[PDB]
Design an enzyme around this catalytic site. Structure first.
Site, PDB file in Angstrom:
ATOM      1  N   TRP A  33       0.870  -1.172   0.000  1.00  0.00           N
ATOM      2  CA  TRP A  33       0.000   0.000   0.000  1.00  0.00           C
ATOM      3  C   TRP A  33       0.902   1.215   0.000  1.00  0.00           C
ATOM      4  O   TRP A  33       1.810   1.314   0.828  1.00  0.00           O
ATOM      5  CB  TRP A  33      -0.846   0.027   1.265  1.00  0.00           C
ATOM      6  N   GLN A  64      -8.313 -10.215   6.418  1.00  0.00           N
ATOM      7  CA  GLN A  64      -7.268  -9.210   6.609  1.00  0.00           C
ATOM      8  C   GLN A  64      -7.846  -7.899   7.153  1.00  0.00           C
ATOM      9  O   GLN A  64      -8.648  -7.235   6.499  1.00  0.00           O
ATOM     10  CB  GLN A  64      -6.491  -8.966   5.312  1.00  0.00           C
ATOM     11  N   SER A 114     -11.433  -9.024   3.552  1.00  0.00           N
ATOM     12  CA  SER A 114     -10.701  -7.974   4.231  1.00  0.00           C
ATOM     13  C   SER A 114     -11.664  -6.910   4.739  1.00  0.00           C
ATOM     14  O   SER A 114     -12.624  -6.544   4.063  1.00  0.00           O
ATOM     15  CB  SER A 114      -9.657  -7.360   3.300  1.00  0.00           C
ATOM     16  N   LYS A 130      -6.304  -8.187  -4.162  1.00  0.00           N
ATOM     17  CA  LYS A 130      -7.611  -7.838  -3.646  1.00  0.00           C
ATOM     18  C   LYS A 130      -8.517  -7.248  -4.733  1.00  0.00           C
ATOM     19  O   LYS A 130      -8.072  -6.482  -5.587  1.00  0.00           O
ATOM     20  CB  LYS A 130      -7.461  -6.837  -2.488  1.00  0.00           C
ATOM     21  N   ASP A 166       1.955  -8.836  -0.425  1.00  0.00           N
ATOM     22  CA  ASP A 166       0.553  -8.445  -0.390  1.00  0.00           C
ATOM     23  C   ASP A 166       0.275  -7.308  -1.365  1.00  0.00           C
ATOM     24  O   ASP A 166       0.906  -6.256  -1.294  1.00  0.00           O
ATOM     25  CB  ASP A 166       0.144  -8.055   1.029  1.00  0.00           C
ATOM     26  N   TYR A 173      -4.020  -0.214  -5.350  1.00  0.00           N
ATOM     27  CA  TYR A 173      -2.738   0.453  -5.084  1.00  0.00           C
ATOM     28  C   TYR A 173      -2.126   0.989  -6.374  1.00  0.00           C
ATOM     29  O   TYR A 173      -1.235   1.834  -6.353  1.00  0.00           O
ATOM     30  CB  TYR A 173      -1.731  -0.460  -4.371  1.00  0.00           C
ATOM     31  N   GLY A 233       1.068   0.988  13.016  1.00  0.00           N
ATOM     32  CA  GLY A 233       0.212   2.152  13.137  1.00  0.00           C
ATOM     33  C   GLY A 233       0.206   3.042  11.906  1.00  0.00           C
ATOM     34  O   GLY A 233      -0.274   4.171  11.979  1.00  0.00           O
ATOM     35  N   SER A 234       0.719   2.522  10.785  1.00  0.00           N
ATOM     36  CA  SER A 234       0.792   3.266   9.522  1.00  0.00           C
ATOM     37  C   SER A 234       1.149   4.722   9.733  1.00  0.00           C
ATOM     38  O   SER A 234       0.372   5.608   9.366  1.00  0.00           O
ATOM     39  CB  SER A 234      -0.537   3.209   8.787  1.00  0.00           C
ATOM     40  N   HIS A 259     -11.682  -6.777  -1.010  1.00  0.00           N
ATOM     41  CA  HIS A 259     -10.971  -5.702  -0.327  1.00  0.00           C
ATOM     42  C   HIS A 259     -11.808  -4.965   0.713  1.00  0.00           C
ATOM     43  O   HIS A 259     -11.285  -4.487   1.717  1.00  0.00           O
ATOM     44  CB  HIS A 259     -10.412  -4.717  -1.344  1.00  0.00           C
ATOM     45  N   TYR A 288      -2.918  -5.969   8.908  1.00  0.00           N
ATOM     46  CA  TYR A 288      -2.334  -4.823   8.225  1.00  0.00           C
ATOM     47  C   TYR A 288      -2.175  -3.639   9.198  1.00  0.00           C
ATOM     48  O   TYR A 288      -2.747  -3.644  10.299  1.00  0.00           O
ATOM     49  CB  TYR A 288      -3.069  -4.462   6.911  1.00  0.00           C
ATOM     50  N   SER A 289      -1.371  -2.655   8.790  1.00  0.00           N
ATOM     51  CA  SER A 289      -1.035  -1.503   9.626  1.00  0.00           C
ATOM     52  C   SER A 289      -0.468  -1.891  11.004  1.00  0.00           C
ATOM     53  O   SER A 289      -0.900  -1.356  12.030  1.00  0.00           O
ATOM     54  CB  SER A 289      -2.252  -0.588   9.783  1.00  0.00           C
ATOM     55  N   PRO A 290       0.520  -2.812  11.033  1.00  0.00           N
ATOM     56  CA  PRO A 290       0.956  -3.271  12.355  1.00  0.00           C
ATOM     57  C   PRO A 290       1.766  -2.237  13.136  1.00  0.00           C
ATOM     58  O   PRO A 290       1.882  -2.335  14.355  1.00  0.00           O
ATOM     59  CB  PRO A 290       1.804  -4.508  12.030  1.00  0.00           C
TER      60      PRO A 290
HETATM   61  N1  LIG Z   1      -6.833  -5.010   3.294  1.00  0.00           N
HETATM   62  C1  LIG Z   1      -6.936  -3.694   3.430  1.00  0.00           C
HETATM   63  O1  LIG Z   1      -7.984  -3.105   3.650  1.00  0.00           O
HETATM   64  C2  LIG Z   1      -5.673  -2.920   3.333  1.00  0.00           C
HETATM   65  C3  LIG Z   1      -5.726  -1.545   3.223  1.00  0.00           C
HETATM   66  C4  LIG Z   1      -4.502  -0.917   3.140  1.00  0.00           C
HETATM   67  C5  LIG Z   1      -3.308  -1.651   3.172  1.00  0.00           C
HETATM   68  N2  LIG Z   1      -3.278  -2.991   3.279  1.00  0.00           N
HETATM   69  C6  LIG Z   1      -2.007  -3.770   3.287  1.00  0.00           C
HETATM   70  O2  LIG Z   1      -1.289  -3.697   4.540  1.00  0.00           O
HETATM   71  C7  LIG Z   1       0.091  -3.346   4.309  1.00  0.00           C
HETATM   72  C8  LIG Z   1       0.843  -2.662   5.473  1.00  0.00           C
HETATM   73  O3  LIG Z   1       0.126  -1.727   6.296  1.00  0.00           O
HETATM   74  P1  LIG Z   1       0.193  -0.098   6.144  1.00  0.00           P
HETATM   75  O4  LIG Z   1       0.788   0.286   4.803  1.00  0.00           O
HETATM   76  O5  LIG Z   1      -1.217   0.383   6.400  1.00  0.00           O
HETATM   77  O6  LIG Z   1       1.096   0.572   7.346  1.00  0.00           O
HETATM   78  P2  LIG Z   1       2.316  -0.055   8.223  1.00  0.00           P
HETATM   79  O7  LIG Z   1       2.868  -1.285   7.538  1.00  0.00           O
HETATM   80  O8  LIG Z   1       1.889  -0.152   9.665  1.00  0.00           O
HETATM   81  O9  LIG Z   1       3.416   1.131   8.218  1.00  0.00           O
HETATM   82  C9  LIG Z   1       3.993   1.666   7.027  1.00  0.00           C
HETATM   83  C10 LIG Z   1       4.854   2.858   7.419  1.00  0.00           C
HETATM   84  O10 LIG Z   1       5.812   2.477   8.415  1.00  0.00           O
HETATM   85  C11 LIG Z   1       7.153   2.657   7.941  1.00  0.00           C
HETATM   86  N3  LIG Z   1       8.052   1.571   8.449  1.00  0.00           N
HETATM   87  C12 LIG Z   1       8.145   0.309   8.002  1.00  0.00           C
HETATM   88  N4  LIG Z   1       9.066  -0.351   8.745  1.00  0.00           N
HETATM   89  C13 LIG Z   1       9.550   0.501   9.677  1.00  0.00           C
HETATM   90  C14 LIG Z   1      10.489   0.393  10.702  1.00  0.00           C
HETATM   91  N5  LIG Z   1      11.150  -0.768  10.931  1.00  0.00           N
HETATM   92  N6  LIG Z   1      10.756   1.463  11.481  1.00  0.00           N
HETATM   93  C15 LIG Z   1      10.118   2.615  11.268  1.00  0.00           C
HETATM   94  N7  LIG Z   1       9.205   2.755  10.296  1.00  0.00           N
HETATM   95  C16 LIG Z   1       8.902   1.709   9.483  1.00  0.00           C
HETATM   96  C17 LIG Z   1       7.014   2.759   6.432  1.00  0.00           C
HETATM   97  O11 LIG Z   1       7.968   3.668   5.914  1.00  0.00           O
HETATM   98  P3  LIG Z   1       8.676   3.410   4.495  1.00  0.00           P
HETATM   99  O12 LIG Z   1       7.644   2.674   3.692  1.00  0.00           O
HETATM  100  O13 LIG Z   1       8.938   4.813   3.992  1.00  0.00           O
HETATM  101  O14 LIG Z   1       9.889   2.585   4.848  1.00  0.00           O
HETATM  102  C18 LIG Z   1       5.648   3.364   6.243  1.00  0.00           C
HETATM  103  O15 LIG Z   1       5.762   4.783   6.373  1.00  0.00           O
HETATM  104  C19 LIG Z   1      -0.009  -2.507   3.053  1.00  0.00           C
HETATM  105  O16 LIG Z   1       1.207  -2.301   2.329  1.00  0.00           O
HETATM  106  C20 LIG Z   1      -1.034  -3.250   2.221  1.00  0.00           C
HETATM  107  O17 LIG Z   1      -0.379  -4.273   1.443  1.00  0.00           O
HETATM  108  C21 LIG Z   1      -4.461  -3.617   3.348  1.00  0.00           C
END
Ligand SMILES: NC(=O)c1ccc[n+]([C@@H]2O[C@H](COP(=O)([O-])OP(=O)(O)OC[C@H]3O[C@@H](n4cnc5c(N)ncnc54)[C@H](OP(=O)(O)O)[C@@H]3O)[C@@H](O)[C@H]2O)c1
Length: 316
Positions: free
Chosen positions: A21, A184, A160, A78, A44, A49, A214-215, A111, A210-212
């Site tokens: 994402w 998901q 999801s 999705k 994923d 996206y 805290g995005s 999705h 997802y968002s583990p």
């Molecule tokens: N099913 C659904 O409804 C749905 C909706 C949205 C997303 N998703 C999926 O869930 C996935 C992940 O969740 P998310 O994108 O919402 O947010 P997330 O994974 O909680 O966090 C992403 C953010 O954290 C940063 N980050 C990653 N590793 C880090 C670390 N070790 N230390 C500090 N910062 C770190 C990333 O920066 P950088 O990227 O700049 O490194 C990015 O800014 C998505 O990519 C997508 O595939 C699903």
């Protein structure tokens, strides 16, 4: 190389995957390439996206250069809710498969449980920005997705952002050939999803988090919105193991047997995020983390509480 979680189809789903994402083009290809090198076997994806074609280039590179075999990759995408009408599920799925340069997907997810206005306007909305609904439901889409499984173009289906109510609506549909293998949803210490996880597992449905972290980079973030990575109590626990808060937040899910998909395009963080199989949170550390539950969502962006199957009203 990771532990996995077994699906009801006996397929094995890698317990840590790479989220994509908001991964920009020109970065996402290298992102996937580093993750595969780093031992990620689970990627994923989503139509919405609008980067699957670049993910597909990366996967293909690494299959080409013998770094990985297709059979050992676990690719998830999705279906977006403006494509719930029947000819559109197939057309949307075919674009995903084509962009990904794959012969089949491992899992195909609905999705979002709410149908939007059919077509390639992915965010149809009124003047106040409210979602414009469509008449096709998630049931209509599921029936069409089931064909893809019949044809071996998708190994398994899932959901999801479903509440337990909408999973019940799915599991209780007369005539259902396939059940979802996973649900998901957003999940982290502020939103621990305890009832939903207990529900899904009781039904043989795995949970993907997802968002583990805290995005944190979400554009809609308020400075008052709580930050998990800067959380002292999360930082205390990280300090104890000499790991990062991020590594603690991913491990938390592994120890609940929940699949987790941290998103990154930064190579150092991609690697960091899978170095989570050389330590273990204690039952006491786990219980402390679970106490942080605030029932707080980082992702509630679709102004859609006015349409029919809204997942977030319900307790679980
Ligand atoms: N099913 C659904 O409804 C749905 C909706 C949205 C997303 N998703 C999926 O869930 C996935 C992940 O969740 P998310 O994108 O919402 O947010 P997330 O994974 O909680 O966090 C992403 C953010 O954290 C940063 N980050 C990653 N590793 C880090 C670390 N070790 N230390 C500090 N910062 C770190 C990333 O920066 P950088 O990227 O700049 O490194 C990015 O800014 C998505 O990519 C997508 O595939 C699903």
């Amino acid at each position: 190389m990771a532990t996995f979680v077994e699906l009801s189809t006996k397929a094995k789903m890698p317990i840590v995957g790479l989220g994509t994402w908001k991964s920009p083009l020109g970065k996402v290809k290298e992102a996937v390439k580093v993750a595969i090198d780093a031992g990620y076997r689970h990627i994923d994806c989503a139509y919405v996206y609008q980067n699957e074609h670049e993910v597909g280039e990366a996967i293909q590179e690494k299959i080409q250069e013998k770094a990985v075999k297709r059979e050992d990759l676990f690719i998830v995408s999705k279906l977006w809710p403006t494509f719930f009408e029947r000819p559109l599920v197939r057309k949307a799925f075919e674009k995903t498969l084509k962009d990904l340069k794959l012969s089949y997907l491992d899992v195909y997810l609905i999705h979002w449980p709410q149908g939007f206005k059919s077509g390639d306007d992915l965010f149809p909305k009124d003047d106040k920005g409210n979602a414009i609904g469509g008449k096709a439901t998630f049931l209509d889409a599921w029936e069409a997705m089931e064909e893809l499984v019949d044809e071996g173009l998708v190994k398994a289906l899932g959901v999801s952002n479903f509440s337990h109510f909408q999973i019940e609506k799915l599991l209780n549909k007369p005539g259902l050939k396939y059940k979802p293998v996973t649900n998901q949803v957003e999940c982290h210490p502020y939103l621990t999803q305890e009832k939903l996880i207990q529900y899904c597992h009781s039904k043989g449905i795995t949970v993907t988090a997802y968002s583990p972290l805290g995005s944190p980079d979400r554009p809609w973030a308020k400075p008052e919105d709580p930050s998990l990575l800067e959380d002292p109590k999360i930082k205390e626990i990280a300090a104890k193991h000499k790991k990062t808060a991020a590594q603690v937040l991913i491990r938390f899910h592994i120890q609940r047997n929940v699949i987790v998909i941290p998103k990154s395009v930064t190579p150092a963080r991609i690697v960091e995020n899978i170095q989570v199989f050389d330590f273990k949170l204690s039952d006491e550390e786990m219980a402390t983390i679970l106490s942080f539950n605030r029932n707080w969502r980082a992702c509630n962006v679709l102004q859609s509480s006015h349409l029919e199957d809204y997942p977030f009203n319900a307790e679980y």
